[PDB]
Structure formats: C-alpha cells, structure tokens
Design an enzyme around this catalytic site. Structure first.
Site, PDB file in Angstrom:
ATOM      1  N   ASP A 282      51.889  51.331  37.278  1.00 48.36           N
ATOM      2  CA  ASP A 282      52.982  50.376  37.427  1.00 48.36           C
ATOM      3  C   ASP A 282      54.124  50.965  38.242  1.00 48.36           C
ATOM      4  OD1 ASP A 282      51.355  48.970  35.629  1.00 48.36           O
ATOM      5  OD2 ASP A 282      52.499  49.694  33.900  1.00 48.36           O
TER       6      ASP A 282
ATOM      7  N   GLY B 256      44.349  71.020  65.454  1.00 49.99           N
ATOM      8  CA  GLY B 256      44.887  72.030  66.353  1.00 49.99           C
ATOM      9  C   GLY B 256      45.189  73.319  65.614  1.00 49.99           C
TER      10      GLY B 256
ATOM     11  N   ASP C 152      55.691  55.572  29.232  1.00 56.99           N
ATOM     12  CA  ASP C 152      56.926  55.801  28.486  1.00 56.99           C
ATOM     13  C   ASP C 152      56.679  55.855  26.983  1.00 56.99           C
ATOM     14  OD1 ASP C 152      56.252  53.134  28.258  1.00 56.99           O
ATOM     15  OD2 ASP C 152      58.324  52.414  28.303  1.00 56.99           O
TER      16      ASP C 152
ATOM     17  N   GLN D 256      37.823  62.006  61.202  1.00 59.47           N
ATOM     18  CA  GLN D 256      39.084  62.286  60.534  1.00 59.47           C
ATOM     19  C   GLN D 256      40.228  61.420  61.032  1.00 59.47           C
ATOM     20  OE1 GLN D 256      38.438  66.979  60.842  1.00 59.47           O
ATOM     21  NE2 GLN D 256      40.008  66.385  59.352  1.00 59.47           N
TER      22      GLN D 256
END
Ligand SMILES: Nc1ncnc2c1ncn2[C@@H]1O[C@H](COP(=O)(O)OP(=O)(O)O)[C@@H](O)[C@H]1O
Ligand SMILES: Nc1ncnc2c1ncn2[C@@H]1O[C@H](COP(=O)(O)OP(=O)(O)O)[C@@H](O)[C@H]1O
Ligand SMILES: Nc1ncnc2c1ncn2[C@@H]1O[C@H](COP(=O)(O)OP(=O)(O)O)[C@@H](O)[C@H]1O
Ligand SMILES: Nc1ncnc2c1ncn2[C@@H]1O[C@H](COP(=O)(O)OP(=O)(O)O)[C@@H](O)[C@H]1O
Ligand SMILES: Nc1ncnc2c1ncn2[C@@H]1O[C@H](COP(=O)(O)OP(=O)(O)O)[C@@H](O)[C@H]1O
Ligand SMILES: Nc1ncnc2c1ncn2[C@@H]1O[C@H](COP(=O)(O)OP(=O)(O)O)[C@@H](O)[C@H]1O
Ligand SMILES: O=P(O)(O)OC[C@H]1O[C@](O)(COP(=O)(O)O)[C@@H](O)[C@@H]1O
Ligand SMILES: O=P(O)(O)OC[C@H]1O[C@](O)(COP(=O)(O)O)[C@@H](O)[C@@H]1O
Ligand SMILES: O=P(O)(O)OC[C@H]1O[C@](O)(CO)[C@@H](O)[C@@H]1O
Ligand SMILES: O=P(O)(O)OC[C@H]1O[C@](O)(CO)[C@@H](O)[C@@H]1O
Lengths: 741, 741, 168
Positions: B154, B562, B107, B650
């Site tokens: 954060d 697939g 910020d 995987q």
C-alpha cells in the site's frame, strides 16, 4: 501467379495472434501477386466502406507480429445482418474490385461471411437493378470466395484443435495463477479463480491441469448431485495432508446437472460455511484477451494465414467456403458449414442436458484430460500392491517440463500400487547408487518448476555398467522411465544392446523425450521446446527494439540446439527474422552475399533494421564472428552490425502451460504403457523383458501417441549429429523465407 | 562481534520482497556472529512456539530471494493481543534465549511488537512468579530490542518513501494494464480497473500516471461536487479527439467529498448511462500480492534487512524501538511510535474530512504527482502563445524511458504555448535538418514503449557544428532538451564551449540523463537503469535455474555498462551472485584464486552451483574467456564452467513502472525549468543565454531534484572512462560481498 | 620474392568479391601439377577481413579441393644479423648525416651561442630516387599520414602489377 484481389478483416472477440495472421495473409497475398486490402472495424467498415478499405503494401503490416489484439479494429456490426447492409458491403467490395475475402473470427463472424457468399449473386443483381454498377462489372466479379480463420481464446470450434489465440490466453492465465500461488501458500488461503470461456471448459480444464487445481467446474462435465459434500471432503483432505493452499478453477459458463449456473460467489460461500477456510475470489476478466501472443500462436497464425491465401487463390465457385484448422500437427482445410453446424450441435446437446452426447461429439481428448486431472488431483487409495519396482531418471540437459513429467509418473505409479524410486543425477547416479523411494507428497509442487529437481547429467551407462547392474539388482528395479534428451535415447539403447551380456538389464524401459533442441527421434515435439522458443522469442523481440531505436543496425543472434535447426527456424518465424542459418540448409558464401544485398535494399525503406539467426553449429567455418565481419564490411556506410549469443537463457524459467500439461500427459501415458508391459512380461515368478518391444520412446506422432521401439529407431537416427534423419518441420522454412522480403 | 540471539518473523499482509529481507537478516546476523531463529506463522507461532521456532544456518534462507510471499508463513494471531498470549510469547523467546526480534509487516504488526517490548519486563516478572523460569534467566534476558521492517504494497507508512513490496505490486499492475490496453484499443472500450491500497491512493496514482489513465479516484483527493458531468466531458473529449480507448483507475478505498465509498460498478453504470460507451470493469485482486519481486524490492529488502541487524546489535534499552526506512535514496532509521502515530494521524485527518490537512501531513510529493497527472491527462487550452521555440533530441544508446520523457516534455511545452520540435537521430539529425513540429496527439501512446521513437545516435556536434548552427537559426530554436546518456552531456558541453565562436549557440540547454549504465554525472539514477537491472536479473535467474539443474556448475555472466559497474553490482545483489568484477574495484590474479577456492568450498555443500558477474570492461587482460579458463582449470574435478554474454537484452523491452513515471516527471520538471530560464534570458527582443547556469543537467540528487550546470560538472567527470569521479553506489559492494559466503 | 599468389595490402582495397576471385584461381591452380598456394596478408590491411576470416573463407569455398593453414611471422621479421646492404647503408647514412650536422651546426653559430630556429635545421636524411637529400621535417608534414603513420605517395606501388602478373 495472380491477377485478382484479396480482402481481410478481423471480427468478433479479438485474440492475441490476429496480428500475425493479418501479416501473413497480407505478405503471402502480395508474394503471390495479388492486391491486398485491409478492411477496418470488421463488418462495420465492410458495410461503411470508404476510408475503412485501403490497399496495403509490404510495410503496412510491419512491426505488428509481437502485438496483441488487432491493428484493424474488429468492431461489431448490426447492419450486416440485414440484406441492405450486405448489398452495401458487396457494393463496396465491387467498387474496390475485391472478389476474395478472408475473415478472422469466431463462429458468428464466419456464419455471416458464408451468408454473404451465399447471396453475393443476388446482391449484385439488385445493385445492377438500381443502377449502382454496370453489367460488365457484375459479370466480372460475379462470385465471392471465402476463407475463414478461427480467432478465439475459447477453443470451442469443432474443426480445429487450437483456435488462434488460446495458447496465449493460457499464458495470461498461468501468469495470474503463478502470482496467486505465492500469497495463497503464504497465508494458507483457498482461492476461487473465474476463467473465461463462453460456454466451453477448455481454458478451465487446461489451466487446472497445468496449475494442479484442487477442484474444477466445467460445463461439459457438470458436477453430480450433492457435490458440495464431495468438494468439502476433498478440500479438507488436501489442507489436512500437507497441501498448504487450495485452488478452485471455475469457468464462466459452469453449470449443475440441471443446467443452472454455478457462481464463484456460491463456491466461496460454500467453502467458508462448510470448512471455515480463509478464502478469496478473483475474476481474471479481459486480461486473457490481451498481451503479447505466445510463440505457438504466432507460428500457427502465420501458417494459417498463408494457407488461407492459398485457399482463396486455388478455390472455384463450385468449391464450398472453407476454414483452415489443426488436425494432428498439420494445417488441414475443412468446409465452413460442417464445422459451424457441428459446433452448434455440440452446444445444443449440452443445452438439452445430453452431456454424454456433447462430450462424445467434441472429441475424446477432452475426456482423457478430464480423467487425467481427476486421477492426479487427489490420492485414490490403491489396492493392487504389485511386487513391481520402478526408477525414474533425468538425463541430458535440463528442460522445462521434466519436473511435471516426474510428478505425473510418480503419482500414477503410486496409484498402481508400485514401489517408485527416483534417481538423482541420471545414469551417473544409478551407477553411484543415489536411489530413494518416493511418495505422493514427496513430489508436491513440482509441476510449476523449471529445470530438474532430481538433477540431470550427460553421462552414458556403458562405462559404469557393472555398477548400474549392481544397483538394479540391489533395489530390485523392474522398469526404468528415463526422461531426457538424446543422451537418454542413447543410454536406453546401450542398456538394450547389453541385455545379452547382462541378465538384469532384461528390464522394461521407456524414454520421455525432454530437451529444448527437439532432436530426439520418435516424436514431433520434445518436452521443453515450447518454453525455449518462447524465451528466445522474447529475447529477439527485445533485440529488435534495440535495433529499431538505433536505426540502421543488423543483429547476428546465435541460438542453441546443436545440429538441429528447429529452435532457430521456429524462433525466426516467430520474430520475423530476415534469415535463419541452419545445418539442414547448407549455405555458401554466395548465399551470404545475397542476404547482405537484401539487407542493403531493406535499409532504403522505412524499416531500417535487420535480424538474422544462426544455429550454434550450422557451419564448420562460417561462424557468428565470420558473419559479423562479412555483414559489417559489405554493409559499410549503409548499416552497422552487432552480435548476440543467447546462452542458457534459452532453457527458460518456469515452463509454459503447454510444457506443464504435455509433461503431465506423457508421464501418465508412459506409466500406463509401462505397467501394461510389466505385467505382460511377468512369467514363472520373475520379470524377463528381452524383446525389442519392451524398450520404447513415448512420443506424439503426426496424429496421436505412439511407442516406437528404441532399436527400431536406430535406423532413422544420426548418432554423429544426434538427431533423426527426416524431420517434419523442414516445411516451415519456406514460410520463413517467404515472410521475409 | 556478537554473543546473542536474533529472532525474525513476517506478519500482516505479505508482499513480494519479504523473502529477500529474511535472507539478508539471517545472513547478516550469522555474519556478525549471532544466532538467528526463524519464527514461523508470525505472531501465531511466536505464541505457540515449539516447532514454530528453529535455528537457521547459512543454507536455511538459500534459494528464496527470487520468490514472492514469505517462506515462514505470516499467519494472523488473536491471542497475542491478550496479555496471556504475550507472556507465552515471551516465555518461548526466553526458552530459546532470544532477546532481539525483527518484525516485517505493516503498522499493526509493528504496533503489537512495541506493545510486546513495552511490557517484556512485567511478562518476565509474571513468569518468574508462577515458577516457569528462574531468577537468573529473567535477569539475563531482562530486555527486548525491536527492529521493524515495513512490508506492504500500500505504501501508507509515513516514515518510509517505499515500503517493501510496492514496486513489485506496480509491476503486477502494469502487466495487467499492458494486457488490457491491447483489447481495449482493439474494441474501443472503456475500462474500470480496481487496484488495491487499503485506504491509500499511492498504487492507483502511480499506476494511472504510468499508464496514461483518463481519470483517477484516490481517497486523498476525493472528487468535487457534480464530478459526474466533468468525467463525462473529459471521456467524451478523449474518445472524440483520436484517443481510441479510455482507462479509469479506481482505488479500493476511493470516496466522495462526503467520505462515502465510490464503487467501480457505479463508475461503469455512469459511463454507460451518460456516454453509451461499451465498457468493462476488472478487479485485479490478489495478483498484486504475489509474483516475483522486482529488482528494486530485492535490493531494498537486502539493505533494510542488513540495517535492521545492525540496529538490533547496536541498540540499548534506553534506545526506543525503531524502523528502517527510505529518506532520499539512503537507509535512514526512525523511531517506531513516531511513524505509527503519524500514519494514524493522517488516517484520522482523512476520516475527519480534512483532506487538505491529510495531504499536507503525508508529504508534498503526492500532491506534485497528482498535479502532474492532471496536467498531462488532457489538453488544457493554452493562452500564452510565447514566441519561444524548442527542440528535443535523443542521443546515446536507446534506453527504456526516453519515449515517456519526450511525451511529458512535448505536452508540457504545448501547454505553455511554445512551438515544439523533435529531432530524429539526435545531433546527427539536427545537423542534417530532420526537424519537425509536434502536436499533442502526435506523441500519444508513447508512454508504454521502450527504445526510441525519434531515434538516437552517438554522434557528437563539434564535427558538424556549422550545419547545427544553420538549422538552429533556420527553425529559430531558442532551447534544446537533449535526453540521453553521456554522449548527450558531452554534446551539450561542446555546444556551451563553442558559444564564443558561434552566437546562435547562446541558447538554453537541459540534459535528461537516460542510459542503462547509470554513468551520467549529476544524478543518482539515470532514466532506463531500472529496466536494465530487471532484465539482467531475469536472465541471471534463468541461468541459476539452469545451473542448479546441472549440478556442480559455475557461470561467468558478462554485463553491459562500459566502465561503470553499477549495473553489475546491483544485478549481483539482486540474484545472489557470488562475485561481481568491476572496474572501480581492481582485482588481480590472487583475488581470482581466492574466489575459486571459495567456489570449491561451496561445492561441498548442498547448494552446488555458482554465479559470478563481470562488467564488460572491468579489466584490460582478465577478460571473460580468461576467467572461464581459470575457473575451469583450478576447479577441475569439482565443477565445470560456462559463459554467458547478456548483450542488448539488457536494454529491456517495455519500461518498468518506475521508468515510465521517472521519465514523465523529469520531462515535466525539465520543461518547467526550461521555460523559467527562457523567459529570464529574454531581453531587448531576443534570447541570449551565455551564463553557464543556462546549460544544466536535471537529476535526482540524494534528496530531491537539482539542476547542475554542465560546465560545473566538468571537474567531477571522467571523459576517458565516461563516468563521474565519485559514485554513491560503491557502498552496496560491501553488502554484495557479505551476502555471498 | 617468394612467388606468392596474392598479397593483401591496405593501399589496395579489397572486398569479398576479390577474395572469391582469388579462391577460384587457387581452385584452378590445384588442377595443375603445382598443387600448392601462398597468399600474404599485411597485419592491418583490413578492419574486418582478418587472417582468421581468410582462413575460414578459403577452407570453406575450397573444401574437397584443398585445405588451408595460417602462419603469423611475428618478430622473426626484425631479423638476426643485418645484411651487407644494411651494414653499408647504415654506415653511409651515419657519416653523411654527421657531415650535414657539422655543417649546419657551424652555420647557426653566432655571437657565442648556437641558435637553430629555421625549419631547415631539422631534417630527414634519406636516399631519394637519385641520391641523398635532407628534407626539412616540417616540409614533410604536408606529405605524411599521422593516422596510419606513412607517407601519402609511395614509390613502390608499381611493383604490385609485376606481383600480380607473375602469379597466374
Ligand atoms: N447469422 C448472421 N448473419 C449475418 N451476420 C452475422 C450473423 N452472425 C453473426 N454475424 C456478424 O458477426 C459479427 C460478430 O459476430 P459474434 O457472433 O457477435 O462474435 P464471435 O465472432 O465471437 O462469434 C457481428 O457483427 C454480425 O454482424
Ligand atoms: N478434483 C476434482 N475436481 C473436480 N471434480 C472432481 C474432482 N474429483 C472428483 N470429481 C468429480 O466428483 C465426483 C466424485 O468423484 P469420483 O471420481 O467419482 O470418486 P469415486 O472413486 O468414489 O467414484 C465425480 O463425478 C468426479 O468427476
Ligand atoms: N503450445 C503448443 N505447442 C505445440 N503444439 C501445440 C501447442 N498447443 C497445442 N498444440 C497442438 O494442438 C493439440 C492440442 O492439444 P489438446 O487437444 O488440448 O490435447 P491432446 O494433445 O492430448 O490431444 C496438441 O495435440 C498439439 O499438437
Ligand atoms: N494493538 C495490538 N496489540 C497486539 N497485537 C497487535 C496489535 N495490533 C496488531 N496486532 C497484531 O498484528 C497482526 C496482524 O496485524 P494487522 O494489523 O491485522 O495487519 P497489517 O500488518 O497489514 O497492519 C495481528 O495478528 C495482531 O496480533
Ligand atoms: N484526468 C483527471 N482525473 C481525475 N481527476 C481529475 C482529472 N482532471 C481533473 N480532475 C479533477 O476534477 C476537477 C475539475 O478539473 P480541474 O483541473 O479543476 O479543471 P479547471 O481548469 O476548470 O479548474 C478538479 O477537482 C480535478 O482535480
Ligand atoms: N523502482 C525504483 N528504482 C529506484 N529508486 C526508486 C524506485 N522506486 C522508488 N525509488 C526511490 O523512492 C522514491 C519514491 O518516489 P515517490 O515518492 O513516489 O515520488 P518522487 O520521486 O517524486 O519523490 C523515489 O524518489 C526513489 O528515490
Ligand atoms: O542437444 P541436447 O543434448 O538435446 O541439449 C541441448 C543443450 O545442450 C547444449 O549444447 C548445452 O550444452 P552444455 O549444457 O553442456 O553447455 C545446448 O545446445 C543446449 O543448451
Ligand atoms: O555507455 P552508454 O553510452 O551510457 O550506453 C551503454 C550501452 O552502450 C554500449 O556500449 C553498447 O554500444 P553499441 O550499441 O554501439 O554496441 C553498452 O555498454 C551498452 O549496451
Ligand atoms: O468482452 P466481452 O464482450 O464481454 O466478451 C466476453 C467473451 O469473450 C470471449 O473470450 C469470447 O469472445 C469469451 O470468453 C467471453 O464470454
Ligand atoms: O487478503 P486480504 O486480507 O483481503 O487483504 C486486503 C488488503 O491487503 C493489502 O494489500 C494490505 O494488506 C490491501 O491492499 C488490501 O486491502
């Protein structure tokens, strides 16, 4: 082969690797025909007894080898120090008929174990006197045999080169340091990293050496008077001369010359006050004591657990209590009180401010690593400025550790006043020129990188030897340091054999073996094998998880390594594989049937899974697809089968802590040997290396480093299959097959 | 499409993921035709200028996507707060002709960026007044356009669901906690873990929810008066009722009701004093700020960097300065001051002890997770004791997250007073019986495990429907919760379609989609896909390292999934793959030629490597061996080619923090919906579920959770290829192809 | 017809033990004067033990005694010109099927239109054990394997005993 009982417990501070030791002790004790009892919560459950002692079968220690900590607790006990608790412990063992005991833990637990042995007879006499047991039982179980395993991350125990769990603690530390270096480099911040190690600086030294730390605090070598100024000078020099970050390692038992503890908070406050650098402090804490065990810890814990069972069953009451340890790279066996007393003597010498005596008592390897670290941390101004010139090559496939060895060799050579060159793409580069001079800062940050920064090729020199000789003469190169695999050994051999035809090849040469396959002759471990075993172990662990989720499944996993079955063998030990098919162990169709029926039998039990490894070139015909079809067909209805091919994932990502340090040490030592020979063969104004002793392979033999001539190794090499005749690791296959049902 | 410049810098606290953002900003800005300038050391180099600003080409941001921190520094600056430093910054940008600026940071950095924009005109006027620049230059560069990226672990910024770098910070935290749990469980020790998060409890809450922590301290929900007694009651209850360890998470900004900071040392001293448990305290420190970025952070950083370039080039001086953020699961764009002001308002409300107002300002998702955590941490004594009975199934292939969802659903159901059953081996089990009732402690510790503890099978129910109906009636099961992949959706659809023939199937059903392939209709993310992308990303990163070591090499990597090309697409984005061949993007031989010639062109540059991914069923004929032969032949002399098949690696090892929390949330929410429908369809003494609304798929849609009926999804499903008709992630392929040259 | 030492067929299930037994017989035959061998394999006799599997097994377990090669008779087996039997057999079936077709076609003609609805109007002409027969197509359905595309019971399974006998 047995008609007696075994007890096992873990005590003291846990270390990741205890689970593999408990599994191996249990499965070897069952294999030998003995009853095995798991004793929970360490000495506390030994005293308490009852449910804390329970008989174990082959499946009680199943699915734990990949877990950290210990499954049987290892709580601390105070009553066992008293004779009342020890007689209660002896009574519990007698009630279960236990006459042998294995204790996994540090010096204190083993000390209590031998005190328990030393009065077992008197405890039985007291139990008979109070009427707890009968005379026949006391005469039957009249003796107690102890075998000790040293589980501790500190690595302070004198009789052992590596305690169970210290390699994995280094893995946790380097995971942390690899995380810190990104943000530290990003923000240009100093960091003070507090590592464990009770009163020992092994963890701090190895981690500092593997991470390129800019300063180190260890209790074995406390800093000299006014060390604050020297620290500020070094840290100012690094951050001034291009080093974006600074790392400070500090053991949790570090001290000054007066034995007074130095706090990490003090180090932070000093660097802030005297340099103004933005800095932080991190205490790694109990992260080091947990996580998955590394590959070496699993293999070692299995070997030591097997050996401990052998010791318990082959011991006699005249035999003293023993521990099983490392010497060289084999499983030796030492007496417990000698090692306990030597460790206490080291601690007392260090407490009495006799730091030189404490250093000489531990062993000279620590001092050598300490000097290597100080040499490579910062640039000492050279003064020799010899006329000698060097080139460094990468040859073969990339391995994790090449960058560490190149950094070590380059900086050692610059320290010796030599002009150092690096060749991009190996012998192919040296033929194509591609030679550049390298400086101290040109190799900074390479320690933590895998692969090859210079680039590596499989090209051999005899096809481009005219161009190689030309570039050797142009750049005036007087020695080569070729770090690589079998192709490096072959290339240096070709250059030596061509010395008669070409005079410029009368040049000193050294080969650093660096390959995942561990196939170079003249060494026990090739630089990069540990990273590859860890990568394959991780992949096979994930595969076992997939198989255990999909119950009744078997996996055929294909490992790299050419014709050398090292990588498949040690991987299979590390992940509990049911079989590992290897060129060095010929197998026919009958053996495959025998393994399939064992897999069918195992599928009747609760552990409905399987895993068989296959070296990529173990058989001309029975390939991985063949084994798939055979296992699927003969196991139809009982289980299904799948195949995996671990391709170039086995070359690994970042190197392990061992590969970093091992590469660094080999680079220094090879460079020292290179400088010695290079000044020896200098005569009448020119270098002239023609003897076979000037072309060698640096390697770690059974005990320590040796430089075998490249031509002498030719009579012990298989150039067809690219591996040595005789290999030290064929003994591990018996343990592999034993740990599998 | 452009004739203007872009500037980019990173500022504030670094976060792993900034490098991917810088790469994407640079490569998109170059693709659009704009000049890109890398500004080093953040605002400090912006003010200083000179060498700190340098033009970037396509290779300047190469080989950084897998690195943490930032390659361009991000130092802090004090002069930029003053108008003298800001005019110097504006002068430097004008000297390099930079009229757009991208700022990556929290910020404060974005606030300074907009203040710089808000007076750019006056700074140019002052520079013209002192004669530094001419009038024509001031009129040409009269405006400054700002696009903001929020990089921070954060996750406090209001306008963004996830700040760049927070998922990876959770990965570092869970690596630490997974290490701690082994030794904590081994020794029966309490642990106090101090997590970062400046004044925010996001990291602490998510990590506590993912780790099953026994207590949590966050500033958004400070503990009530006399919380010490309630803590001691809970921790005594856990360690008494079988929970071997206790974990206490504490954010670094935690407070009491009076806003006074609660220290981790206080928490340790309290548990020691009031319970006597052996305990420790660990401050994780700056480990969270470093390491490799996780898969989601790389994908998100790439998407946000692309979107930021679009914003800079399509903005106008009337347009306010903007940030690019998450809303739902898409890249929205919000105005900078609104988000800055909302974050400040939240902080002020929390500072003014208006904790309810601060909670309502951030968003209700935090409160829902906070209530889910408290529900599942400890067993609240139920009182309903309904007659309802449940069964929970695993179906399909194992996925990382199934165990988390089962634990969440079981404990929520036991909290609602139901009798809960678990089925071993899915529908095949339910046909074969294999039903057992489960308790609160029977599912303890499952949160951290991958695979499937119950066991999963691909079997579908219609072949054994008589046996399924029999077991449904015997155990009186009134609802099913089938957690699994496409086979689970198919099975529940078959049970619904068989309701007319069988009355016992008039039963409430819910499907939790859990599969690596992300092919179940009715959701954007399937439970277990994040773990699979991370595993494939790690493997492909190691492959790229191997390829870069062996220069001039290309790899063909085969991914699972697939016919669904999600896993290959997002993996290829995460590892910078040059191509990803997918069923949803049909490709012919011409496209393969076009990719081969691009690979030939890329091999002329300094980055002499390549990586193309191939889904396991993207093409009937052009298999992976086909692509190998084509690439090897047409690239002969320029490069060589190798193939890898990522098999069941995987499926991953342990689940990621996201999969743990996502599974936990889905288990709770599915169980709540299940209880609501189950009491709705109860009439005249019996359950009777016949409407299609009683059989649904819980899934996270574009915005939030939805329960789509299983039959309604049938018109949007491909039962041939087992995936939905329309998929949200096909837009990512344009970014994939853009980031590759 | 070619004296093959083995013919692996779906209708005769075989496991790895049978392949070993055939390999050792081939090893024994290689000690004699006839040092050759020939084993046939139907293209779909086994799900796993394909022709490459048998190649690898025979090459490995017969190492040093003999070597192994593979052949795949593709669409050469459809042949060139038909044999004299196929010419006459096709001619006879065409005549006889047409005669049966004309007979049924004039039988099912009624009230100015053809209307064949009984199952007897859809048949397979074939040479049974003795002579020609016209089996209804639906009646054959209970004796057909639509998964493997062949009848349940086949007359020629008796010839396998002669095949195995003529081979040592
Ligand atoms: N001299 C001793 N006599 C009897 N028991 C001992 C003795 N020393 C240690 N023990 C036992 O060893 C256990 C733990 O050993 P400790 O020294 O505290 O940790 P470590 O194994 O790391 O050295 C203790 O529970 C204690 O009962
Ligand atoms: N990088 C370092 N880390 C920790 N200690 C160091 C380091 N460098 C030097 N020291 C120690 O500080 C002292 C001064 O360094 P030294 O090697 O003696 O320099 P010199 O060449 O002047 O003798 C020595 O006792 C040394 O062991
Ligand atoms: N990760 C490892 N892989 C293989 N062997 C190891 C590993 N770690 C330690 N060892 C063995 O134990 C010894 C410990 O090495 P160390 O004493 O620290 O230094 P040095 O090797 O110079 O003597 C090593 O020499 C090695 O034989
Ligand atoms: N109000 C402001 N005006 C000008 N510059 C600012 C302002 N606020 C912050 N900055 C700049 O942002 C940089 C770092 O921002 P900071 O707030 O400290 O970290 P973070 O990005 O995490 O919020 C500082 O160097 C500062 O120059
Ligand atoms: N596991 C926990 N971790 C952190 N805070 C908790 C936990 N459990 C309860 N709390 C908080 O402590 C207080 C008491 O717990 P609570 O849920 O209100 O019990 P009750 O059912 O009696 O109302 C509450 O404010 C709650 O938010
Ligand atoms: N690891 C991740 N993988 C995919 N998407 C994620 C991941 N992390 C966060 N997201 C997305 O950002 C959102 C952040 O979730 P959060 O706000 O913490 O709780 P909730 O999902 O209940 O709203 C998620 O809803 C998701 O859409
Ligand atoms: O056998 P070496 O030469 O020591 O290196 C081992 C590597 O060589 C390999 O054969 C790989 O070869 P390529 O890189 O040429 O494909 C693997 O066994 C392994 O990755
Ligand atoms: O496609 P699903 O059913 O969602 O699960 C994906 C997994 O299933 C697979 O088909 C694997 O199947 P198997 O485990 O039976 O070999 C792969 O595509 C992938 O590993
Ligand atoms: O968990 P504890 O009891 O604080 O143990 C701390 C000690 O553990 C060790 O690893 C050895 O037990 C030492 O490094 C450390 O001093
Ligand atoms: O490294 P520093 O300056 O101490 O930053 C600490 C802060 O970094 C952050 O990650 C955000 O910048 C916070 O969690 C923490 O309070």
């Amino acid at each position: 082969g047995a008609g007696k009982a075994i007890g096992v417990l873990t005590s003291g501070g846990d270390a990741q690797g205890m689970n593999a030791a408990v599994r191996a002790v249990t499965r070897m004790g069952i294999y030998v025909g003995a009853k095995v009892f798991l004793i929970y919560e360490g000495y506390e459950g030994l005293v308490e007894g009852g449910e804390n002692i329970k008989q174990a079968n082959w499946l009680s220690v199943s699915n734990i080898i990949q877990l950290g900590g210990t499954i049987i607790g290892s709580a601390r006990c105070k009553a066992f120090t008293t004779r009342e608790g020890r007689r209660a412990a002896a009574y519990n063992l007698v009630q279960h008929g236990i006459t042998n005991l294995c204790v996994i833990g540090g010096d204190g637990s083993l000390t209590g174990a031998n005190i328990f042995r030393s009065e077992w007879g008197s405890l039985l006499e007291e139990l008979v006197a109070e009427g707890k047991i009968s005379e026949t039982t006391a005469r039957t179980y009249s003796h107690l045999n102890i075998a000790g395993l040293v589980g501790s991350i500190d690595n302070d125990f004198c009789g052992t080169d590596m305690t169970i769990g210290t390699d994995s603690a280094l893995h946790r530390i380097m995971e942390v340091i690899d995380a810190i270096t990104t943000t530290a480099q990003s923000h240009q911040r100093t960091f003070v990293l507090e590592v464990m190690g009770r009163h020992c600086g092994y963890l701090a030294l190895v981690s500092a050496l593997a991470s390129g730390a800019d300063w180190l605090f260890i209790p074995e070598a406390p800093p000299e008077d006014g060390w604050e100024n020297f620290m500020c000078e070094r840290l100012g020099e690094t951050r001034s001369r291009g080093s974006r970050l600074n790392i400070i390692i500090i053991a949790e038992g570090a001290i000054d010359r007066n034995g007074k503890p130095i706090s990490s908070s003090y180090v932070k406050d000093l660097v802030v006050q005297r340099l103004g650098f933005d800095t932080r402090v991190t205490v790694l804490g109990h992260v080091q004591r947990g996580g998955t065990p590394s590959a070496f810890d699993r293999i070692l814990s299995s070997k030591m657990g097997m050996e401990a069972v052998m010791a318990l069953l082959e011991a006699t009451p005249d035999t003293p209590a023993c521990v099983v340890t490392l010497s060289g790279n084999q499983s030796v066996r030492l007496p417990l009180m000698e090692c306990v007393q030597m460790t206490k003597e080291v601690q007392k010498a260090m407490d009495d401010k006799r730091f030189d005596e404490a250093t000489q008592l531990r062993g000279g390897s620590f001092e050598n690593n300490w000097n290597i670290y100080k040499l490579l941390a910062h640039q000492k101004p050279p003064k020799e400025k010899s006329n000698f010139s060097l080139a460094i090559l990468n040859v073969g496939a990339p391995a994790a550790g090449m960058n560490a060895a190149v950094r070590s060799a380059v900086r050692t050579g610059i320290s010796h006043g030599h002009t150092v060159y690096v060749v991009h793409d190996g012998f192919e580069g040296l033929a194509k020129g591609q030679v550049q001079e390298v400086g101290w800062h040109d190799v900074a940050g390479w320690l933590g990188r895998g692969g090859s920064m210079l680039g590596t090729k499989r090209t051999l020199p005899k096809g481009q030897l005219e161009s190689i000789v030309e570039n050797i003469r142009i750049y005036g190169i007087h020695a080569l340091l070729v770090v690589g695999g079998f192709e490096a050994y072959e290339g240096v051999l070709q250059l030596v054999e061509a010395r008669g035809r070409y005079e410029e090849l009368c040049i000193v040469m050294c080969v650093i073996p660096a390959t995942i396959s561990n196939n170079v002759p003249g060494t026990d471990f090739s630089l990069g094998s540990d990273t590859a075993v860890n990568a394959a172990m991780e992949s096979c662990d994930r595969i076992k998880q997939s198989a255990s989720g999909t119950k009744r499944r078997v996996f055929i996993v294909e490992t790299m390594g050419g014709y050398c079955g090292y990588l498949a063998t040690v991987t299979g030990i590390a992940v509990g594989a049911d079989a590992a098919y290897v060129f060095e162990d010929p197998f026919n169709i009958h053996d495959l049937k025998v393994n399939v029926e064992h897999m069918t039998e195992k599928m009747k039990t609760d552990i409905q899974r399987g895993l068989v490894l296959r070296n990529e070139k173990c058989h001309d015909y029975y390939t991985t697809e063949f084994l798939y079809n055979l296992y699927s067909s003969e196991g139809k209805g009982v289980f299904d089968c799948r195949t995996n091919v671990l391709g170039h994932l086995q070359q690994g990502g970042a190197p392990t802590p061992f590969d970093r340090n091992y590469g660094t040490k080999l680079g220094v030592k090879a460079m020292l040997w290179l400088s010695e020979k290079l000044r020896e063969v200098y005569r009448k104004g020119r270098v002239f290396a023609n003897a076979p002793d000037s072309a060698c392979v640096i390697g770690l033999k059974k005990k320590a480093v040796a430089f075998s001539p490249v031509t002498e190794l030719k009579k012990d090499t298989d150039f067809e299959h690219r591996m040595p005749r005789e290999q030290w690791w064929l003994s591990l296959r018996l343990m592999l097959k034993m740990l599998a049902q």
